[PDB]
Amino acid sequence: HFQLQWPGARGAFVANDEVYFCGAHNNVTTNRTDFPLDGSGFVSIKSGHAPYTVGAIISLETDADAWEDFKNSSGGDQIAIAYRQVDNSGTYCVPFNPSSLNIAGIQDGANATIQVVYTGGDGNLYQCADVTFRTTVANLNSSVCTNSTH
């Protein structure tokens, strides 16, 4: 199972609820994290076990309340962070520049939900982060962005 370290999830981590859309926090929140478009951004998680496979899908709907909100015109998931295998437990952090995505609507002031998709042998697990993209972001502490060796 896993937790979002940054950007923060919609609500509290509940292990059993990770099998549901957005970890059962199905409605969008209004307390969004500002997320930079200048390439200083990242997504940081912590896993209790490894190996696991992780990626992220993205919705540019303000009201990202359903699976379909994360799908493109051709019915595929809008992949924000490509799936990869991770062989260490503890922290795992990937840089993320939304400017890299072939998606309409990525600009300053745009709202989005990043939904992390994880499988570690104990189900298909999900957590969601509601963000607002900003050209830049000031107080960003990149110190939580590390990969562990555990």
Positions that interact with Cu ion (CB under 5 A)? 1, 120, 122
d(CA 106, CA 42): 16
User: Smaller CB distance to ligand NAG: residue 8 or 90?
Assistant: 8
Distance of alpha carbon 107 from its chain centroid, rounded?
A: 18
Segment interacting with ligand NAG, rule: CB under 6 A, options 14-22, 45-53, 88-96, 112-120: 88-96
Q: Among 19, 2, 5, 14, which residue's Cα sits nearest to residue 141?
A: 5
User: Smaller CB distance to Cu ion: residue 1 or 134?
Assistant: 1
Binds ligand NAG (CB under 6 A): choice among 14, 15, 84, 150 = 84
30 binds, among Cu ion, ligand NAG, none (CB under 5 to 8 A by kind): ligand NAG
Distance of alpha carbon 45 from its chain centroid, rounded?
A: 9
d(CA 145, CA 40): 11
Token pair 């990770």 in the structure block, residue: 18
19 contributes a contact to ligand NAG by CB under 6 A: no
Question: CA angle, corner 23, sides to 67 and 29, nearest 5?
Answer: 80
User: Smaller CB distance to Cu ion: residue 3 or 33?
Assistant: 3
Binds ligand NAG (CB under 6 A): choice among 60, 93, 116, 117 = 93
